[PDB]
Enzyme design. Structure first.
Site, PDB file in Angstrom:
ATOM      1  N   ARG A   1       0.848  -1.187   0.000  1.00 47.16           N
ATOM      2  CA  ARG A   1       0.000   0.000   0.000  1.00 47.16           C
ATOM      3  C   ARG A   1       0.885   1.238   0.000  1.00 47.16           C
ATOM      4  O   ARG A   1       1.604   1.494   0.967  1.00 47.16           O
ATOM      5  CB  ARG A   1      -0.937  -0.011   1.215  1.00 47.16           C
ATOM      6  CG  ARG A   1      -1.786   1.234   1.340  1.00 47.16           C
ATOM      7  CD  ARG A   1      -2.656   1.130   2.582  1.00 47.16           C
ATOM      8  NE  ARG A   1      -3.657   0.079   2.430  1.00 47.16           N
ATOM      9  CZ  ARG A   1      -4.282  -0.507   3.437  1.00 47.16           C
ATOM     10  NH1 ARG A   1      -4.005  -0.199   4.696  1.00 47.16           N
ATOM     11  NH2 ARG A   1      -5.220  -1.412   3.178  1.00 47.16           N
TER      12      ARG A   1
ATOM     13  N   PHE B   1       1.276  10.604   1.768  1.00 48.25           N
ATOM     14  CA  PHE B   1       0.994  10.097   3.103  1.00 48.25           C
ATOM     15  C   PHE B   1       2.017   9.060   3.563  1.00 48.25           C
ATOM     16  O   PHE B   1       2.770   9.330   4.510  1.00 48.25           O
ATOM     17  CB  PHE B   1      -0.425   9.536   3.158  1.00 48.25           C
ATOM     18  CG  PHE B   1      -1.492  10.591   3.013  1.00 48.25           C
ATOM     19  CD1 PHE B   1      -1.911  11.339   4.102  1.00 48.25           C
ATOM     20  CD2 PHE B   1      -2.071  10.832   1.779  1.00 48.25           C
ATOM     21  CE1 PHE B   1      -2.895  12.306   3.960  1.00 48.25           C
ATOM     22  CE2 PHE B   1      -3.044  11.812   1.620  1.00 48.25           C
ATOM     23  CZ  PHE B   1      -3.462  12.543   2.709  1.00 48.25           C
TER      24      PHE B   1
ATOM     25  N   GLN C   1       3.395   1.518   3.083  1.00 42.42           N
ATOM     26  CA  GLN C   1       3.094   0.468   4.056  1.00 42.42           C
ATOM     27  C   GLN C   1       3.473  -0.917   3.542  1.00 42.42           C
ATOM     28  O   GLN C   1       3.205  -1.270   2.383  1.00 42.42           O
ATOM     29  CB  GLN C   1       1.612   0.509   4.418  1.00 42.42           C
ATOM     30  CG  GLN C   1       1.178  -0.523   5.470  1.00 42.42           C
ATOM     31  CD  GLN C   1      -0.300  -0.393   5.837  1.00 42.42           C
ATOM     32  OE1 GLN C   1      -0.920   0.661   5.658  1.00 42.42           O
ATOM     33  NE2 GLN C   1      -0.867  -1.471   6.357  1.00 42.42           N
TER      34      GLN C   1
ATOM     35  N   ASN D   1      -1.787  -1.358  12.344  1.00 41.29           N
ATOM     36  CA  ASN D   1      -2.613  -2.163  13.234  1.00 41.29           C
ATOM     37  C   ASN D   1      -4.064  -2.116  12.774  1.00 41.29           C
ATOM     38  O   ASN D   1      -4.443  -1.344  11.889  1.00 41.29           O
ATOM     39  CB  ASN D   1      -2.475  -1.696  14.701  1.00 41.29           C
ATOM     40  CG  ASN D   1      -3.058  -0.303  14.947  1.00 41.29           C
ATOM     41  OD1 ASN D   1      -4.204  -0.022  14.601  1.00 41.29           O
ATOM     42  ND2 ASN D   1      -2.260   0.574  15.559  1.00 41.29           N
TER      43      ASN D   1
ATOM     44  N   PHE E   1       4.530   1.181   8.599  1.00 40.07           N
ATOM     45  CA  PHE E   1       4.484   2.168   7.525  1.00 40.07           C
ATOM     46  C   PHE E   1       5.578   3.207   7.727  1.00 40.07           C
ATOM     47  O   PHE E   1       6.040   3.437   8.848  1.00 40.07           O
ATOM     48  CB  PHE E   1       3.089   2.823   7.403  1.00 40.07           C
ATOM     49  CG  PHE E   1       2.625   3.580   8.653  1.00 40.07           C
ATOM     50  CD1 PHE E   1       2.194   2.899   9.783  1.00 40.07           C
ATOM     51  CD2 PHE E   1       2.575   4.956   8.658  1.00 40.07           C
ATOM     52  CE1 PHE E   1       1.738   3.601  10.914  1.00 40.07           C
ATOM     53  CE2 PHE E   1       2.133   5.683   9.768  1.00 40.07           C
ATOM     54  CZ  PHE E   1       1.698   4.994  10.899  1.00 40.07           C
TER      55      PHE E   1
ATOM     56  N   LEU F   1      -2.685  10.189  13.430  1.00 43.63           N
ATOM     57  CA  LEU F   1      -2.363   8.832  13.863  1.00 43.63           C
ATOM     58  C   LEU F   1      -1.699   8.785  15.237  1.00 43.63           C
ATOM     59  O   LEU F   1      -1.525   7.688  15.781  1.00 43.63           O
ATOM     60  CB  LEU F   1      -1.456   8.159  12.832  1.00 43.63           C
ATOM     61  CG  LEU F   1      -2.042   8.091  11.423  1.00 43.63           C
ATOM     62  CD1 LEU F   1      -1.066   7.368  10.488  1.00 43.63           C
ATOM     63  CD2 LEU F   1      -3.398   7.388  11.445  1.00 43.63           C
TER      64      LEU F   1
ATOM     65  N   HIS G   1      -1.069   4.689  16.579  1.00 48.02           N
ATOM     66  CA  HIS G   1      -0.012   3.836  16.066  1.00 48.02           C
ATOM     67  C   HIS G   1       1.274   4.120  16.827  1.00 48.02           C
ATOM     68  O   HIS G   1       1.622   5.287  17.041  1.00 48.02           O
ATOM     69  CB  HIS G   1       0.165   4.076  14.558  1.00 48.02           C
ATOM     70  CG  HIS G   1      -1.073   3.774  13.779  1.00 48.02           C
ATOM     71  ND1 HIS G   1      -1.271   2.575  13.127  1.00 48.02           N
ATOM     72  CD2 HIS G   1      -2.188   4.512  13.560  1.00 48.02           C
ATOM     73  CE1 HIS G   1      -2.458   2.587  12.545  1.00 48.02           C
ATOM     74  NE2 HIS G   1      -3.039   3.747  12.800  1.00 48.02           N
TER      75      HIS G   1
HETATM   76  C1  LIG Z   1     -11.132   8.313   3.930  1.00 51.80           C
HETATM   77  C2  LIG Z   1     -10.002   7.830   3.055  1.00 51.80           C
HETATM   78  N1  LIG Z   1      -8.840   7.456   3.863  1.00 51.80           N
HETATM   79  C3  LIG Z   1      -7.698   8.213   4.108  1.00 51.80           C
HETATM   80  C4  LIG Z   1      -7.476   9.595   3.655  1.00 51.80           C
HETATM   81  C5  LIG Z   1      -7.436  10.596   4.616  1.00 51.80           C
HETATM   82  C6  LIG Z   1      -7.185  11.908   4.240  1.00 51.80           C
HETATM   83  N2  LIG Z   1      -7.165  12.912   5.201  1.00 51.80           N
HETATM   84  C7  LIG Z   1      -7.176  12.584   6.635  1.00 51.80           C
HETATM   85  C8  LIG Z   1      -6.399  13.571   7.473  1.00 51.80           C
HETATM   86  N3  LIG Z   1      -6.838  14.935   7.187  1.00 51.80           N
HETATM   87  C9  LIG Z   1      -6.193  15.887   8.091  1.00 51.80           C
HETATM   88  C10 LIG Z   1      -6.505  15.232   5.798  1.00 51.80           C
HETATM   89  C11 LIG Z   1      -7.284  14.337   4.860  1.00 51.80           C
HETATM   90  C12 LIG Z   1      -7.013  12.194   2.890  1.00 51.80           C
HETATM   91  N4  LIG Z   1      -7.052  11.239   1.941  1.00 51.80           N
HETATM   92  C13 LIG Z   1      -7.273   9.958   2.299  1.00 51.80           C
HETATM   93  C14 LIG Z   1      -7.283   8.926   1.191  1.00 51.80           C
HETATM   94  C15 LIG Z   1      -6.123   9.133   0.242  1.00 51.80           C
HETATM   95  O1  LIG Z   1      -8.484   9.045   0.432  1.00 51.80           O
HETATM   96  C16 LIG Z   1      -8.711   7.934  -0.432  1.00 51.80           C
HETATM   97  C17 LIG Z   1      -6.859   7.486   4.962  1.00 51.80           C
HETATM   98  C18 LIG Z   1      -7.496   6.226   5.213  1.00 51.80           C
HETATM   99  C19 LIG Z   1      -7.150   5.103   5.968  1.00 51.80           C
HETATM  100  C20 LIG Z   1      -8.002   4.002   6.006  1.00 51.80           C
HETATM  101  C21 LIG Z   1      -9.203   4.039   5.290  1.00 51.80           C
HETATM  102  C22 LIG Z   1      -9.587   5.145   4.556  1.00 51.80           C
HETATM  103  C23 LIG Z   1      -8.719   6.235   4.514  1.00 51.80           C
HETATM  104  C24 LIG Z   1      -7.632   2.789   6.758  1.00 51.80           C
HETATM  105  C25 LIG Z   1      -8.127   1.541   6.577  1.00 51.80           C
HETATM  106  S1  LIG Z   1      -7.314   0.421   7.590  1.00 51.80           S
HETATM  107  C26 LIG Z   1      -6.362   1.711   8.234  1.00 51.80           C
HETATM  108  N5  LIG Z   1      -6.656   2.887   7.752  1.00 51.80           N
HETATM  109  C27 LIG Z   1      -5.253   1.458   9.200  1.00 51.80           C
HETATM  110  C28 LIG Z   1      -4.237   0.443   8.650  1.00 51.80           C
HETATM  111  N6  LIG Z   1      -4.550  -0.922   9.056  1.00 51.80           N
HETATM  112  C29 LIG Z   1      -4.166  -1.984   8.329  1.00 51.80           C
HETATM  113  O2  LIG Z   1      -3.728  -1.870   7.190  1.00 51.80           O
HETATM  114  C30 LIG Z   1      -4.238  -3.311   8.981  1.00 51.80           C
HETATM  115  C31 LIG Z   1      -4.194  -4.504   8.064  1.00 51.80           C
HETATM  116  C32 LIG Z   1      -3.004  -4.203   8.900  1.00 51.80           C
HETATM  117  C33 LIG Z   1      -2.607  -5.099  10.050  1.00 51.80           C
HETATM  118  C34 LIG Z   1      -2.853   0.879   9.107  1.00 51.80           C
HETATM  119  O3  LIG Z   1      -2.326   0.401  10.106  1.00 51.80           O
HETATM  120  N7  LIG Z   1      -2.200   1.851   8.375  1.00 51.80           N
HETATM  121  C35 LIG Z   1      -0.922   2.464   8.765  1.00 51.80           C
HETATM  122  C36 LIG Z   1      -1.163   3.951   8.936  1.00 51.80           C
HETATM  123  C37 LIG Z   1      -1.743   4.498   7.639  1.00 51.80           C
HETATM  124  C38 LIG Z   1      -3.023   3.746   7.241  1.00 51.80           C
HETATM  125  N8  LIG Z   1      -2.774   2.310   7.168  1.00 51.80           N
HETATM  126  C39 LIG Z   1      -3.477   4.186   5.870  1.00 51.80           C
HETATM  127  O4  LIG Z   1      -3.451   3.491   4.871  1.00 51.80           O
HETATM  128  O5  LIG Z   1      -3.897   5.447   5.880  1.00 51.80           O
HETATM  129  C40 LIG Z   1      -4.149   6.035   4.563  1.00 51.80           C
HETATM  130  C41 LIG Z   1      -4.272   7.547   4.739  1.00 51.80           C
HETATM  131  C42 LIG Z   1      -4.287   8.218   3.362  1.00 51.80           C
HETATM  132  C43 LIG Z   1      -3.056   8.052   5.525  1.00 51.80           C
HETATM  133  C44 LIG Z   1      -5.540   7.931   5.531  1.00 51.80           C
END
Ligand SMILES: CCn1c(-c2cc(N3CCN(C)CC3)cnc2[C@H](C)OC)c2c3cc(ccc31)-c1csc(n1)C[C@H](NC(=O)[C@H]1C[C@@H]1C)C(=O)N1CCC[C@H](N1)C(=O)OCC(C)(C)C2
Ligand SMILES: Nc1nc2c(ncn2[C@@H]2O[C@H](COP(=O)(O)OP(=O)(O)NP(=O)(O)O)[C@@H](O)[C@H]2O)c(=O)[nH]1
Ligand SMILES: [Mg+2]
EC number: 5.2.1.8
Lengths: 164, 168
Positions: free
Chosen positions: A54, A59, A62, A101, A112, A121, A125
């Site tokens: 990912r 951002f 991962q 997590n 990540f 976060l 995390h």
């Molecule tokens: C709304 C759309 N969206 C968005 C999002 C958020 C913003 N902003 C939020 C903050 N403001 C201030 C500005 C705008 C803008 N653009 C988008 C995206 C690009 O729009 C498509 C995120 C996100 C995360 C999840 C689901 C939907 C999500 C998600 C789904 S599971 C999760 N997080 C946590 C993830 N667990 C797992 O994998 C488990 C399987 C393993 C064991 C996890 O440990 N990590 C590590 C940390 C990062 C996280 N993954 C991840 O991938 O974060 C993506 C990110 C883009 C950083 C945030």
């Protein structure tokens, strides 16, 4: 003295370059030890061969699912999962290394690397390291990502271990 | 060309939004948990004799990003509101999703279907009558489903298309 580990990154099997990390054993010893041991492979399993499943530009990158290789798996050296050690350290900017997590106390092996500050976060995390050398490799990994994280080439940890 | 319907699947983390969608699109059941960021799918089907193109937005249940749902609620034509029949909190979360959809679209009349998923599991905490009464108070259909056995999968998505048709 905090340990240092390295990843040699490849892109569809072709070499890209080396990223090294300082692991904050002085603040999160149990979490740093898990990442250190998985980077040497000393338990018979670990990060070598696994991919960054990912990558979302702006951002983070991962990876760390070496058990199922699809982003659902991974395991720690302590069992399948282990508890959140502490949230002392924050997601302050690019290069921060932190545990992925699925909610409280579900750390395994996925992790990540931040490519921007991700302060929302904080307290969810466990931060345990930072890129020391090769941040430009992480920057170069970003263009193989996409809005939802799907990668357009296979980004893998071709080799990894601990540096002296 | 055939009419396209923009369907949006919403609900709390882990209720089975992705398992239902992947069952619809690919006819198999994902046993592992792959948490969704955002995914989109296309599938043509025949509903009540008429062929149409489903455009499905599979959304994240993460509460942390609840502020960022407004944009896909603006675009979506109909909403599959999913809870898990063994997860009472996910059933309680339904009210907040419907309230958010009504607020974003500024309408009391948004095509929606209530879906109670995981009906194959024996640990049921939300009674069928409980969900049926809630759906009746909303004026929308209620469908029980299992992504694992495929029970009700087609019915849930097709019923939502029928709700959009009645609205349009
Ligand atoms: C709304 C759309 N969206 C968005 C999002 C958020 C913003 N902003 C939020 C903050 N403001 C201030 C500005 C705008 C803008 N653009 C988008 C995206 C690009 O729009 C498509 C995120 C996100 C995360 C999840 C689901 C939907 C999500 C998600 C789904 S599971 C999760 N997080 C946590 C993830 N667990 C797992 O994998 C488990 C399987 C393993 C064991 C996890 O440990 N990590 C590590 C940390 C990062 C996280 N993954 C991840 O991938 O974060 C993506 C990110 C883009 C950083 C945030
Ligand atoms: N027994 C059973 N398990 C199901 C059913 N639907 C989903 N699951 C399981 O429940 C877990 C979560 O399913 P998933 O479809 O990922 O849920 P989600 O609502 O998309 N989660 P997210 O909001 O994080 O994207 C998975 O282990 C999946 O196999 C069902 O009908 N029956
Ligand atoms: Mg999902």
């Amino acid at each position: 003295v905090n340990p240092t580990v390295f990843f040699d990154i490849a892109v569809d099997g072709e070499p890209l370059g080396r990223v090294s990390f300082e692991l904050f054993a002085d603040k999160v010893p149990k979490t740093a030890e898990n990442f250190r041991a998985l980077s040497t492979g000393e338990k018979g399993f670990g990060y070598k061969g696994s991919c960054f499943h990912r990558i979302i530009p702006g951002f983070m990158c991962q990876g760390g699912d070496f058990t199922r290789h699809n982003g659902t798996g991974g395991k720690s050296i302590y069992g399948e999962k282990f508890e959140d050690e502490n949230f002392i350290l924050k997601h302050t900017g690019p290069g921060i290394l932190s545990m992925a997590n699925a909610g409280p106390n579900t750390n395994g092996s996925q992790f990540f690397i931040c490519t921007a500050k991700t302060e929302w976060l904080d307290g969810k995390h466990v931060v345990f390291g930072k890129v020391k050398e090769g941040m430009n490799i992480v920057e170069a990994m970003e263009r193989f990502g996409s809005r939802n994280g799907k990668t357009s080439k296979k980004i893998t940890i071709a080799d990894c271990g601990q540096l002296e | 060309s055939m009419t396209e319907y923009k369907l949006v699947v919403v609900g709390a983390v882990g209720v089975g939004k992705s398992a239902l969608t992947i069952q619809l699109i690919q006819n198999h059941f994902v046993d592992e948990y792959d948490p969704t960021i955002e995914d989109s799918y296309r599938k043509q089907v025949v509903i009540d004799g008429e062929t149409c193109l489903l455009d499905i937005l599979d959304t994240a249940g993460q509460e942390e990003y609840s502020a960022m749902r407004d944009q896909y609620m603006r675009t979506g034509e109909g909403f599959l509101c999913v809870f898990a029949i063994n997860n009472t909190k996910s059933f309680e979360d339904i009210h907040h999703y419907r309230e958010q959809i009504k607020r974003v679209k500024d309408s009391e009349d948004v095509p929606m279907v209530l879906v109670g998923n995981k009906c194959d599991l024996p640990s049921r905490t939300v009674d069928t009558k409980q969900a049926q009464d809630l759906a009746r108070s909303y004026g929308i259909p209620f469908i029980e489903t299992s992504a694992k056995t495929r029970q009700g999968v087609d019915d849930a998505f097709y019923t939502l298309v029928r709700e959009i048709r009645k609205h349009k």
